[PDB]
């Protein structure tokens, strides 16, 4: 753990987003993401805009429509709630910005897609390292607080198509300004 070595350290968090989550009729807590707005600005701007609802649409009231234990939880389909919908603030879909960042471990936030250059509003939150998705899905954030809430969602009962048996809803969401951007660990 020598500090010189240590300092030579991942991307800087430039803005935060919160989700307040519900499972069935139960409040389960807040998750806070730190987003890498200097590394993937276009991707971060899309996520943050959808969290604030500033374009007249976005994540509020949408579901986590797929949960796979020891893999990830997925949501952001605010138009159909099943993985076939959603749209970006740039149009239906938008290209892969870069693959600078990897799925380093649990709690990393990455764009769902249906092939090259098909990013919309759908995202997933890893609950393990998912290195097989590196270079194919655009990573743009990390859970900073509330990983325990993520784990509650991850463990919720699902049907045979990995759909939660109780709806897991984003009850509220929004952005939190970060005055002094700060680097986090690549893990």
């Amino acid at each position: 753990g020598p500090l010189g070595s240590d300092e030579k350290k991942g991307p800087k968090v430039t803005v935060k987003v919160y989700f307040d989550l519900r499972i069935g009729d139960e409040d389960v807590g807040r998750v806070i993401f730190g987003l890498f707005g200097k590394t993937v600005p276009k991707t971060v701007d899309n996520f943050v805009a959808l969290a604030t609802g500033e374009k007249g649409f976005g994540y509020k009231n949408s579901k986590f429509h797929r949960v796979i234990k020891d893999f990830m939880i997925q949501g952001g389909d605010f138009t159909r709630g099943d993985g076939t919908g959603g749209k970006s603030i740039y149009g239906e879909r938008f290209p892969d910005e870069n693959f600078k960042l990897k799925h380093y471990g649990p709690g990393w936030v990455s764009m769902a897609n249906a092939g090259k250059d098909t990013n919309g509003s759908q995202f997933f939150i890893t609950t393990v390292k998912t290195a097989w998705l590196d270079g194919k899905h655009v990573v743009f954030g990390k859970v900073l607080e509330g990983m325990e809430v993520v784990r509650k969602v991850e463990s919720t009962k699902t049907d045979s198509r990995d759909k939660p048996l109780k709806d897991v809803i984003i009850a509220d969401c929004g952005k939190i300004e970060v005055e002094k951007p700060f680097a986090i660990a690549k893990e």
Binding site: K38, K100, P181
Partner: peptide, 9 residues
């Protein structure tokens, strides 16, 4: 393309 300060190592 890379920026060490903002993207990390």
């Amino acid at each position: 393309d890379w920026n060490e300060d903002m993207d990390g190592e």
